[PDB]
Design a binder for this molecule. Structure first.
Ligand SMILES: *[C@@H]1O[C@H](CO)[C@@H](O[C@@H]2O[C@H](CO)[C@@H](O[C@@H]3O[C@H](CO)[C@@H](O)[C@H](O)[C@@H]3O)[C@H](O)[C@H]2NC(C)=O)[C@H](O)[C@H]1NC(C)=O
Lengths: 49, 49
Protein backbone atom coordinates (compact mmCIF):
# COMPACT_ATOMS: atom_id res chain seq x y z
CA UNK A 1 0.00 0.00 0.00
CA UNK A 2 2.91 2.43 0.47
CA UNK A 3 5.20 1.52 -2.39
CA UNK A 4 7.20 2.86 -5.30
CA UNK A 5 7.28 1.56 -8.80
CA UNK A 6 9.26 1.25 -12.01
CA UNK A 7 7.21 1.71 -15.12
CA UNK A 8 8.37 0.83 -18.63
CA UNK A 9 6.32 0.71 -21.81
CA UNK A 10 8.15 0.19 -25.09
CA UNK A 11 7.48 -0.64 -28.71
CA UNK A 12 8.13 -4.34 -29.33
CA UNK A 13 9.95 -3.74 -32.60
CA UNK A 14 13.21 -2.72 -31.04
CA UNK A 15 12.63 -5.50 -28.66
CA UNK A 16 11.35 -8.22 -30.83
CA UNK A 17 14.44 -7.21 -32.79
CA UNK A 18 16.53 -7.77 -29.72
CA UNK A 19 15.54 -8.92 -26.22
CA UNK A 20 15.89 -7.00 -23.01
CA UNK A 21 18.57 -7.99 -20.50
CA UNK A 22 17.79 -10.93 -18.25
CA UNK A 23 14.98 -9.55 -16.07
CA UNK A 24 12.89 -11.65 -13.71
CA UNK A 25 12.78 -12.63 -10.08
CA UNK A 26 15.29 -15.32 -10.96
CA UNK A 27 17.68 -12.65 -12.18
CA UNK A 28 17.65 -11.21 -8.72
CA UNK A 29 18.03 -14.63 -7.26
CA UNK A 30 21.01 -15.72 -9.34
CA UNK A 31 22.50 -12.30 -8.94
CA UNK A 32 22.72 -13.16 -5.32
CA UNK A 33 25.80 -14.06 -3.29
CA UNK A 34 25.76 -17.59 -1.91
CA UNK A 35 22.45 -18.92 -3.16
CA UNK A 36 23.26 -21.82 -0.94
CA UNK A 37 25.48 -22.08 2.03
CA UNK A 38 26.76 -25.58 1.70
CA UNK A 39 30.16 -26.61 2.74
CA UNK A 40 32.07 -24.20 4.79
CA UNK A 41 34.31 -21.90 2.81
CA UNK A 42 37.96 -22.60 2.22
CA UNK A 43 40.11 -20.66 4.66
CA UNK A 44 38.45 -22.12 7.69
CA UNK A 45 39.27 -25.80 7.75
CA UNK A 46 37.46 -27.60 10.54
CA UNK A 47 37.37 -28.19 14.25
CA UNK A 48 39.18 -31.33 15.37
CA UNK A 49 38.56 -33.31 18.56
CA UNK B 1 67.45 -12.85 13.79
CA UNK B 2 67.73 -12.73 17.54
CA UNK B 3 71.42 -12.29 16.83
CA UNK B 4 70.68 -9.62 14.26
CA UNK B 5 69.21 -7.61 17.14
CA UNK B 6 72.40 -8.35 19.12
CA UNK B 7 74.53 -6.84 16.41
CA UNK B 8 71.99 -3.97 16.35
CA UNK B 9 71.53 -3.42 20.14
CA UNK B 10 75.09 -4.12 21.21
CA UNK B 11 76.12 -1.93 18.21
CA UNK B 12 78.65 -4.32 16.62
CA UNK B 13 77.72 -4.75 13.00
CA UNK B 14 77.96 -3.42 9.48
CA UNK B 15 75.53 -3.08 6.56
CA UNK B 16 77.36 -5.91 4.79
CA UNK B 17 77.00 -8.72 7.31
CA UNK B 18 73.58 -7.20 7.74
CA UNK B 19 72.92 -7.46 4.04
CA UNK B 20 74.65 -10.83 4.00
CA UNK B 21 72.16 -12.63 6.17
CA UNK B 22 69.21 -10.70 4.81
CA UNK B 23 69.91 -12.82 1.80
CA UNK B 24 69.98 -15.84 4.06
CA UNK B 25 66.83 -14.67 5.78
CA UNK B 26 64.40 -14.33 2.95
CA UNK B 27 65.46 -17.70 1.59
CA UNK B 28 64.81 -19.89 4.58
CA UNK B 29 61.69 -17.87 5.19
CA UNK B 30 60.68 -18.92 1.73
CA UNK B 31 62.14 -22.40 1.95
CA UNK B 32 59.94 -22.95 4.97
CA UNK B 33 56.89 -21.92 3.03
CA UNK B 34 57.33 -25.07 0.96
CA UNK B 35 57.30 -27.20 4.13
CA UNK B 36 54.02 -26.08 5.72
CA UNK B 37 50.33 -26.87 5.21
CA UNK B 38 47.42 -25.12 3.56
CA UNK B 39 45.67 -24.81 6.91
CA UNK B 40 48.44 -22.40 7.84
CA UNK B 41 49.91 -25.05 10.07
CA UNK B 42 53.46 -26.16 9.48
CA UNK B 43 55.00 -29.60 9.13
CA UNK B 44 58.45 -31.08 8.84
CA UNK B 45 57.91 -32.24 5.25
CA UNK B 46 54.34 -31.26 4.42
CA UNK B 47 53.90 -30.46 0.74
CA UNK B 48 54.27 -33.26 -1.82
CA UNK B 49 52.54 -35.40 0.86
C1 LIG C 1 67.56 -1.74 16.16
O1 LIG C 1 67.69 -0.79 15.10
C2 LIG C 1 67.15 0.50 15.36
C3 LIG C 1 67.28 1.37 14.11
O2 LIG C 1 67.99 2.58 14.41
C4 LIG C 1 67.91 1.04 16.55
O3 LIG C 1 67.73 2.46 16.68
C5 LIG C 1 66.44 2.79 17.22
O4 LIG C 1 65.61 3.37 16.21
C6 LIG C 1 64.36 3.85 16.70
C7 LIG C 1 63.49 4.29 15.52
O5 LIG C 1 62.13 4.39 15.95
C8 LIG C 1 64.62 5.00 17.66
O6 LIG C 1 63.38 5.60 18.07
C9 LIG C 1 63.52 7.03 17.99
O7 LIG C 1 62.63 7.73 18.87
C10 LIG C 1 62.92 9.12 18.92
C11 LIG C 1 62.05 9.79 19.97
O8 LIG C 1 60.66 9.57 19.66
C12 LIG C 1 62.67 9.74 17.54
O9 LIG C 1 63.04 11.13 17.57
C13 LIG C 1 63.47 9.02 16.46
O10 LIG C 1 63.04 9.47 15.17
C14 LIG C 1 63.29 7.51 16.57
O11 LIG C 1 61.96 7.17 16.15
C15 LIG C 1 65.38 4.44 18.85
O12 LIG C 1 65.72 5.49 19.76
C16 LIG C 1 66.66 3.75 18.39
N1 LIG C 1 67.25 3.05 19.51
C17 LIG C 1 66.54 2.78 20.61
C18 LIG C 1 65.26 2.03 20.39
O13 LIG C 1 66.91 3.13 21.72
C19 LIG C 1 67.44 0.31 17.79
O14 LIG C 1 68.26 0.67 18.90
C20 LIG C 1 67.49 -1.21 17.60
N2 LIG C 1 66.35 -1.81 18.27
C21 LIG C 1 65.45 -2.53 17.60
C22 LIG C 1 64.71 -1.80 16.52
O15 LIG C 1 65.25 -3.71 17.86
Amino acid sequence: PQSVCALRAVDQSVLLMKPDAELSASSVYNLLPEKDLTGFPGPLNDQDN
Amino acid sequence: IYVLDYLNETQQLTPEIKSKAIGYLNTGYQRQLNYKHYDGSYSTFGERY
